[PDB]
Design an enzyme around this catalytic site. Structure first.
Site, PDB file in Angstrom:
ATOM      1  N   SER A 175       0.811  -1.208   0.000  1.00 14.85           N
ATOM      2  CA  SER A 175       0.000   0.000   0.000  1.00 14.85           C
ATOM      3  C   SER A 175       0.841   1.252   0.000  1.00 14.85           C
ATOM      4  O   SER A 175       1.323   1.714  -1.036  1.00 14.85           O
ATOM      5  CB  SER A 175      -0.881   0.035   1.244  1.00 14.85           C
ATOM      6  OG  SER A 175      -1.331  -1.262   1.563  1.00 14.85           O
ATOM      7  N   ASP A 189      -5.872   4.837  -2.981  1.00 13.30           N
ATOM      8  CA  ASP A 189      -4.546   4.307  -2.702  1.00 13.30           C
ATOM      9  C   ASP A 189      -4.000   3.598  -3.943  1.00 13.30           C
ATOM     10  O   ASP A 189      -4.640   3.548  -4.998  1.00 13.30           O
ATOM     11  CB  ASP A 189      -4.544   3.439  -1.436  1.00 13.30           C
ATOM     12  CG  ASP A 189      -5.376   2.171  -1.558  1.00 13.30           C
ATOM     13  OD1 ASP A 189      -6.153   2.013  -2.530  1.00 13.30           O
ATOM     14  OD2 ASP A 189      -5.215   1.288  -0.664  1.00 13.30           O
ATOM     15  N   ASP A 194      -3.221   0.529  -4.975  1.00 12.75           N
ATOM     16  CA  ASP A 194      -3.907  -0.637  -5.521  1.00 12.75           C
ATOM     17  C   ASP A 194      -5.414  -0.432  -5.610  1.00 12.75           C
ATOM     18  O   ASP A 194      -6.139  -1.359  -5.993  1.00 12.75           O
ATOM     19  CB  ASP A 194      -3.554  -1.896  -4.716  1.00 12.75           C
ATOM     20  CG  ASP A 194      -4.111  -1.876  -3.301  1.00 12.75           C
ATOM     21  OD1 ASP A 194      -4.355  -0.786  -2.737  1.00 12.75           O
ATOM     22  OD2 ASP A 194      -4.336  -2.963  -2.740  1.00 12.75           O
ATOM     23  N   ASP A 231      -8.094  -0.348  -3.853  1.00 13.84           N
ATOM     24  CA  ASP A 231      -9.218  -0.925  -3.125  1.00 13.84           C
ATOM     25  C   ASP A 231      -9.800   0.032  -2.085  1.00 13.84           C
ATOM     26  O   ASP A 231     -10.844  -0.276  -1.495  1.00 13.84           O
ATOM     27  CB  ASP A 231      -8.857  -2.284  -2.488  1.00 13.84           C
ATOM     28  CG  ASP A 231      -7.672  -2.205  -1.553  1.00 13.84           C
ATOM     29  OD1 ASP A 231      -7.007  -1.148  -1.504  1.00 13.84           O
ATOM     30  OD2 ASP A 231      -7.391  -3.211  -0.863  1.00 13.84           O
TER      31      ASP A 231
END
Ligand SMILES: O=P(O)(O)OC[C@H]1O[C@H](O)[C@@H](O)[C@@H](O)[C@@H]1O
Ligand SMILES: [Ca+2]
Length: 448
Positions: free
Chosen positions: A97, A237, A239, A241
């Protein structure tokens, strides 16, 4: 000593001492022995080392006879979606993250994108990897490249009635992660005008590692909204999600309030359904779900607990205040894309701004924001808080740490499962002064 990269929810560590290609290959071998039958989906984020770690995972999986479906550069939700959609045995997303530049990681799922966590397979993988001194075998199965996003994009767009959408102007801020690629694939099918901020994927992160919660990063989206007269802004963020919303004034909307709002949006499409929520901040969600004809279901925080509870309840939607929103027909998984499509539809259909959609709720259930504490003795500090308030006889609930409901105010105080921190959340029944005095009081106790 155990490998430190194996956390409660996923794998993450500094490259190369905590995570490296050797360990990645051994993780692939160990994962193959943990899954039911079928191929394994692999995807990765924009970090520079992610492709090589994914290749190593693939080599280990294929040495163990697993066909690999390489979905390429993607968001975590795409590994979830493709694992479930293609009926794969499991999937791994190579991502870290908001960890430093020398960090990477992996998020692992089995069939239907069901999470693999510490006590549901991840520490079994850890222990296998830890003891594996075998010679690496050679691949016996193949890898296929499957970058077709058609079914994924169709799924995302199925949540909205495109003919009801208005040409809203939306700021989008990928933070140089991967979200911009999906925004651009959705854009031909939508009437919105996008104001693209930090849009290009760049694992060197020239504008900072993606973390919309840091004020300097928050302000980049806020400024773009204000300077362009945008209806609202969305940041993600790396990625993607997690999604973060900014109203037309540039104000960041605390994620708590998106849970009740998105629940109402989903309940209009799937009436009477159950909605799963976390215990950190609750009163607004419970009321808004009930007002919309849904049934709220309290659940411990953490994506795997939310998803398991949604499955057992056939819940239509789940949401955490930590910026994760889960959708039953999306493999019970979280998406950073579905939420903003729903909000854009709500603004389009209602004629109300995002600010108006939340304003009265934020006044009715004001919250502290999540306040984090790294103290010398977390257990003693929690005990000091509880001892101080014992004479008020709050209603106590132990779903996730300690929740204490005093009547006109409540708090949740719990240890994080991703960081060695205590996390505090306070809310009141429309009382900003009580909110501040109690929040400061608890803070002083925790620091004592
Ligand atoms: O407060 P915690 O325990 O650190 O978890 C914070 C969040 O971390 C990740 O983003 C996910 O696992 C979320 O489900 C979780 O809510
Ligand atoms: Ca994320």
């Amino acid at each position: 000593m155990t490998l430190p990269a194996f956390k409660a929810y996923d794998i993450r560590g500094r490259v190369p001492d905590e995570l490296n290609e050797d360990l990645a290959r051994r993780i692939g071998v160990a994962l193959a022995a943990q899954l039911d039958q079928g191929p394994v989906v692999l995807g990765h984020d924009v970090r520079l080392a992610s492709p090589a770690l994914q290749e190593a995972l693939s080599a280990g999986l294929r040495a163990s006879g697993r066909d690999v479906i390489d979905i390429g550069l993607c968001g975590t939700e795409e590994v979830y979606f493709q694992t479930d959609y293609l009926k794969a045995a499991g999937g791994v997303m190579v991502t870290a993250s908001h960890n430093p530049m020398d960090y990477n990681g992996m998020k692992l799922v089995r069939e239907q994108a069901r999470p693999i966590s510490s006590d549901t397979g991840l520490f079994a993988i850890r222990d296998t990897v830890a003891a594996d001194t075998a010679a690496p075998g050679e691949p016996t199965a193949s890898e296929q490249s499957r970058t077709d996003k058609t079914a994924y994009l169709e799924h995302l767009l199925s949540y909205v009635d495109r003919s009801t959408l208005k040409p809203l102007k939306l700021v989008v801020n990928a933070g140089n992660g991967g979200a911009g690629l999906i925004v651009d694939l959705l854009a031909p099918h939508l009437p919105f005008e996008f104001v693209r901020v930090f849009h290009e994927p760049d694992g060197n992160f020239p504008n900072g590692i993606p973390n919309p919660l840091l004020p300097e990063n928050r302000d980049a989206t806020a400024k773009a909204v204000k300077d362009n007269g945008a209806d609202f802004g969305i940041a993600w963020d790396g990625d993607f999600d997690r999604c973060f919303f900014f109203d037309h004034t540039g104000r960041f909307i605390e994620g708590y309030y998106l849970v009740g709002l998105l629940a109402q949006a989903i309940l209009a499409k799937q009436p009477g359904g159950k909605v799963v929520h976390d215990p950190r901040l609750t009163w607004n969600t419970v009321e808004q779900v009930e007002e919309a004809g849904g049934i709220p279901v309290l659940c411990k925080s953490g994506h795997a607990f939310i998803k398991e509870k949604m499955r057992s309840e056939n819940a239509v939607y789940g949401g955490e205040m930590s910026a994760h929103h889960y959708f039953r027909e999306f493999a019970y998984a979280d998406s950073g894309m579905i939420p903003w499509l729903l909000i854009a539809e709500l603004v389009s259909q209602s004629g109300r701004s995002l600010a108006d959609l939340v304003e009265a709720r934020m006044q009715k259930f004001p919250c502290s924001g999540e306040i984090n504490f790294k103290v010398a003795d977390a257990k003693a500090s929690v005990a000091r808080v509880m001892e101080h308030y014992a004479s008020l006889s709050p209603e106590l609930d132990y779903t996730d740490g300690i929740s204490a409901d005093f009547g006109q105010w409540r708090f949740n105080l719990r240890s994080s499962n991703t960081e060695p921190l205590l996390r505090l959340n306070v809310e009141t029944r429309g009382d900003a002064a009580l909110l501040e005095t109690r929040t400061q009081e608890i803070s002083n106790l925790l620091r004592g």
